[PDB]
Amino acid sequence: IQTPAYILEEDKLRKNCELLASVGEKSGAKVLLALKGFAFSGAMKIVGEYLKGCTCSGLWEAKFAKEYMDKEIHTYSPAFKEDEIGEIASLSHHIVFNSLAQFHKFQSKTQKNSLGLRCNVEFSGRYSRLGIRAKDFENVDLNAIEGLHFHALCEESADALEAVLKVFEEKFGKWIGQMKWVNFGGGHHITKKGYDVEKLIALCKNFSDKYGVQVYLEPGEAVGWQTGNLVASVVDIIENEKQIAILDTSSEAHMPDTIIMPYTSEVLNARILATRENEKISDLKENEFAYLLTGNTCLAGDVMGEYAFDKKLKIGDKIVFLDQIHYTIVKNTTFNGIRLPNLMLLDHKNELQMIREFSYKDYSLRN
Amino acid sequence: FYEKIQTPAYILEEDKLRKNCELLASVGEKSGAKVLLALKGFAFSGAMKIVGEYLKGCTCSGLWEAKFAKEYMDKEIHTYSPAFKEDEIGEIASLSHHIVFNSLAQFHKFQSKTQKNSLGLRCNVEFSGRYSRLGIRAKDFENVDLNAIEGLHFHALCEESADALEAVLKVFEEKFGKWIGQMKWVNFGGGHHITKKGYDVEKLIALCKNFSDKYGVQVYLEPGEAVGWQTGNLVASVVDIIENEKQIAILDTSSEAHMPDTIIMPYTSEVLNARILATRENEKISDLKENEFAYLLTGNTCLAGDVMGEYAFDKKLKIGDKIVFLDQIHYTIVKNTTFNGIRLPNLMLLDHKNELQMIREFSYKDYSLRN
Ligand SMILES: *Cc1c(COP(=O)(O)O)cnc(C)c1O
Ligand SMILES: *Cc1c(COP(=O)(O)O)cnc(C)c1O
Ligand SMILES: NCCCNCCCN
């Protein structure tokens, strides 16, 4: 590994997609990759051996689905524009509108697509712009709408989906039986250890039998969950009261959700002792060595955390940030002109494959 | 002016940029300090030649910024990194006039590959910070052979005043004083909000001039934000307007992808002809007046939290109206994203003749070739 690099493990992605395929086969639901979280171009054909297509937020994702996967394309945007709707309609099997005005504006340009409406389920979200509330369905012509859609969950359980479906059916139930399909969105933490997979299958099966509809699920995170790591090197080690490792990667540019959320990444063969925000998480044990892990941007707060290792770090050691393929790459930056981590794939034969190697132009042509 | 443009777009105004640069050139003129653009915050490719009319060069964090400085400006190049790497030091050395190291180890490791460059060390001034990895603390200078070192560097400020640089200089001279006289230059870093209304320019000039004279050193300043301050806006359109208790305008831009610092810091952008009533985080800022209309302005990503804030306007918004987010050229473009495949704002220049030029028009490949 020339560093930094995001490295997706084929074997792990395959195990995730096997489980998701199993959910679809046992429940009758169709499972789609939500590209927002996980769009790893080197793995799109692999994902497509298992899943039915992509869910896409607009033109660029729809184009990406077409090019990389070429399976079903489902497109939802809070904001379709006039200049893009034609190409989106040419590519998309399903198009979900966020408002009735959007539906009405674009219905005549989407006559070959199966149309849906996003439903605001209003379930603990106040003042959300996403979806249509139930009261606004009264009096509206739904003859041209074949699907209802919701997305209401983030890193959640089968029990949470049950709770959402209960409210979805109480508020929207009069309009469900007349649809061909319903899309339960994403946020289902299906490949996480301990998730109640049998419950999800039963919920999807039971709903489909109850209303005679095709169920769709559109996980993003669950596809990329624990499928790979960001690998960095120790470039320098300095002392300022604590021992501090400066790495060739950056929180802010390469793991931006660690700063936004905020959260602290786990590190292979290490334990988190304290967060960058100085929250104490654990105490150092015997025969452990504490380091601040820090990044290569010029920012004062480019700090991953304080971590306990069981050996001393040396310049040139590799640090492995765990579970860094979803909601990372898709949102990363070239801030401060920091060299981007290459995208790599560890294939089923344990051979490392370069998928994208970035260069100066990735930075210069974006400024 | 804005009506025929594809939105969204960041629009830099030449006249405003030139006013800032005139002022920074005035500081250099009067103090003898040499002023550099810190590319971290402002790297607008279409403006680099304009900035070079006024400033002496660029401060760069590494290889990619040094190459950009070389290509776009072709003036002095000053490189500092907390973490130089072996695979890049060669090319950084061929491009840079000054190289500033973050630690003695990094200096000792790369001294022999940097013989044609002027070498500096970054000083941790330790002032109001704890556990900072940036710079060397004064105690670690003691009894170190500094023969090969021609400059000292600090960067200790953010959006600050001439009085705050005065307080930092006092601490810097107190702690590192005994080694300043032997240097050829000192670099006072960035964070000087020189072009903000009210800044005490006169005092900055005196501080720089006195310091220069006292120690017999060439002083360097390396503002980023100051160069870009109030030079331009991000222009978006209202794509849809919906209601959920409040009126909500959904725009073709995203706080998360296009104004990331609004989410990270967090802070709320001002909007042309509007007043902030409340932040995305529900902080009350002001009350609606009698003849105004309140709207939540929100983005086009699929995230629930892609909300800019609640703002008061003098008239109702309509689909197709342009929303102008004020002061969006610095610490924006340089750190924006194609998250959710959102179409990037184009980069445009409103030039000195009031003509709008396209600098960069983005496309699908800017997204697909990054995933
Ligand atoms: C984000 C999103 C998804 C995927 O959510 P995950 O948490 O990654 O599973 C699915 N559908 C829509 C409409 C989304 O906005
Ligand atoms: C960020 C930075 C600057 C510029 O800072 P501004 O606040 O944009 O003026 C200059 N030098 C160094 C070393 C920096 O990290
Ligand atoms: N005035 C700039 C402060 C330094 N860094 C800011 C980085 C956040 N965009």
Closest CA to B178 of B142, B150, B149, B145: B142
* Same-domain pairing of A43 and A175: yes
Q: With H, G, I as helix, E, B as strand and everything else as coil, classify residue B232.
A: strand
Find residue A293's DSSP bridge partners: A245, A305
**Residues in chain A after which the backbone breaks (C–N beyond 2.5 Å):** 124
Among A225, A253, A280, the domain-final residue is A225
- Record the tokens describing residue A229, joined without a space: 């790591």
d(CA B242, CA A69) in angstroms, rounded, equals 34
CA-nearest of B146, B144, B100 to B123 is: B100
Residue type, A81: K
The answer to whether residues A202 and A236 belong to one domain is: no
The experimental method, as deposited, was: X-ray
| Ligand 1 atom index nearest CA of A326 | 8
> Which residues in chain B are contacts of A77 at CB distance < 8 A?
300, 302
- Domain count for chain A, please give it: 2
Tell whether B9 and B142 lie within a shared domain: no
DSSP string across A204-268: HHHHHHHHT-EEEE--SHHHHTTSEEEEEEEEEEEEESEEEEEESS-HHHHSHHHHHTT----BT
Ligand 1, pocket residues at CB < 6 Å: A 34, 36-37, 55, 76, 151, 154, 185-187, 218-222; B 302
The backbone torsions φ and ψ at residue B203, rounded to the nearest 5 degrees and listed phi first, read: -65, -40
**A41–B83: do the CB atoms touch at under 8 Å?**
no
CB contact under 8 A, B371 and A333: no
User: DSSP letter string over A261-281?
Assistant: TT----BTTEEEEE-TT--B-
Task: Say yes or no: A35 contacts chain B, CB-CB below 8 A.
Answer: yes
Q: Which residue has the tokens 């902030």?
A: B276
Q: What is the resolution of this structure in A?
A: 1.9
CA of A153 vs chain B CAs: smallest distance (Å)? 11
Question: Given CB atoms, is A130 within the 8 Å cutoff of chain B?
Answer: yes
Yes or no: say if B133 and A239 are a contact pair by the CB < 8 Å rule. Answer: no
Closest-CA residue to A81 (of B250, B208, B77, B12): B250
**Test the A interface: residue of B64, B70, B79 with most A CBs within 10 Å:** B64
- Find the residue in B nearest to A42 (Cα): B371
Determine whether B42 is exposed, middle or buried from the number of CB atoms within 10 Å of its CB (0-12, 13-18, 19+). buried
Chain centroid offset of residue B162 CA: 18
For residue A3 the two structure tokens come to 């560093």
Of A181, A206, A225, which residue is a domain's last? A225
Which residues partner with B118 through β-bridges? B98
Same domain, A272 and A336: yes
Same domain, B55 and B128: yes
Q: From residue B220, how far is each of A7, A225, B335 by CA, in Å?
A: 41, 48, 26
CB proximity A76 to B under 8 Å? yes
- Our CA angle for B287, B289, B291, nearest 5°, is 155
Within 13 Å, how many C-alpha atoms sit on residue B28's CB side? 19
Same domain, A44 and A179: yes
Q: Rounded to whole angstroms, how far apart are CA atoms A43 and A224? A: 10
- The pairing of strands B346-350 and A53-56 is unpaired
> Nearest CA to A25 among A186, A158, A197?
A197
DSSP state of B178: G
* CA neighbor of B218 nearest in space, from B26, B25, B33, B59: B33
CA dihedral B194, B199, B200, B206 (to 10 degrees): -10
* Mode of pairing for the β-strands spanning B218-221 and B34-38: parallel
Residue B194, domain CATH:
3.20.20.10
How many Cβ atoms sit within 10 Å of the Cβ of residue A316?
9
Structural domain boundaries enclosing A142: 10-225
Q: Are residues B3 and B52 located together in one domain of the fold? A: no
Indicate whether B118 and B253 sit together in one domain. no
- The alpha-helical segments, DSSP class H, found in A69-185 are 85-91, 100-106, 158-176
| Whole-angstrom Cα Rg for chain A | 22
A119 by DSSP, 3-state: which? strand
CATH number at residue B343: 2.40.37.10
**Contact flag A129-B246 (C-beta cutoff 8 Å):** no
Any CB–CB contact under 8 A between B45 and chain A? Answer: yes
| b/e map B51-85, b = 16+ CB within 10 Å | bbebbbbbbbbbbbbbbbbbebbebbbbbbbbbbb
Contact of B222 with B38, CB cutoff 8 Å: yes
Tell me the two tokens of residue B86. 């072996």
Pairwise CA distance, residues B152 & A111, whole Å:
68
Q: Which residue has the tokens 């000087």?
A: B192
Residue B78 CA to residue B208 CA, distance in Å, equals 19
Do B133 and B46 reside in the same domain of the chain? yes
Give the closest of B132, B263, B335 to A335, CB-based.
Answer: B335
Shortest-distance atom of ligand 2 to CA B331: 8
Number of the ligand 2 atom closest to the C-alpha atom of B40 = 1
CB contact under 8 Å between B364 and A35, yes or no, is no
Please report, as a single letter, which amino acid is at residue B356: L
Which sign, positive or negative, has the C-alpha torsion A337, A365, B346, A330? Answer: negative
Same domain, A2 and A19: no
Q: Residue A296 is nearest to which of B68, B81, B333, comparing CB atoms?
A: B81
Assess B361–A contact: CB distance below 8 Å, yes or no.
no
- Between the alpha carbon of residue A284 and those of residues A277, A293, A314, A318, B4, the distances in Å are 18, 15, 19, 21, 61
Residue of minimum CA distance from atom 5 in ligand 2: B190
B333 in contact with chain A, both atoms CB, cutoff 8 A: yes
Phi/psi of residue A217, nearest 5 degrees: -120, 145
Cα–Cα separations (whole angstroms), residue B19 to A43, B50, B51, B200, B225: 50, 11, 11, 16, 14
Q: Is B234 exposed, middle or buried (0-12, 13-18, 19+ CB in 10 A)?
A: buried
Instruction: Say if residue A278 is in the same domain as residue A179.
Output: no
Tokens of B345: 């704002």
Chain B: residue whose CA lies nearest to A66 = B368
Distance, in Å, from the CA atom of A317 to the CA atom of A89, rounded to the nearest integer, reads: 50
Choose among A83, A82, A120: nearest CA to A100: A120
Residue B365's SS3 state is: helix
The reply to whether B67 and B182 lie within a common domain is: yes
DSSP A154: S
Integer Cα distance of B51 and A342 in angstroms: 33
Sign of CA dihedral A102, A103, A108, A113: positive
What is the rounded (10 degree) CA torsion for B138, B142, B145, B150? 30
Alpha helices by DSSP H, listed for chain B, are 14-31, 48-54, 63-72, 86-95, 104-110, 162-176, 201-215, 225-228, 255-258, 260-264, 365-368
Quickly list DSSP for B273-322.
TEEEEE-TT--B--PPPTT-EEEEEE-SSS-TT-EEEEEEESS---TT-E
The continuous run of DSSP H or E covering A27 comes out as helix A10-27
Cis status, amide bond into B223, omega within 30 of 0? no
Which tokens belong to B66? 């040094």
Cα separation of B371 and A11, whole Å? 20
- Domain final position from A225, A240, A269: A225
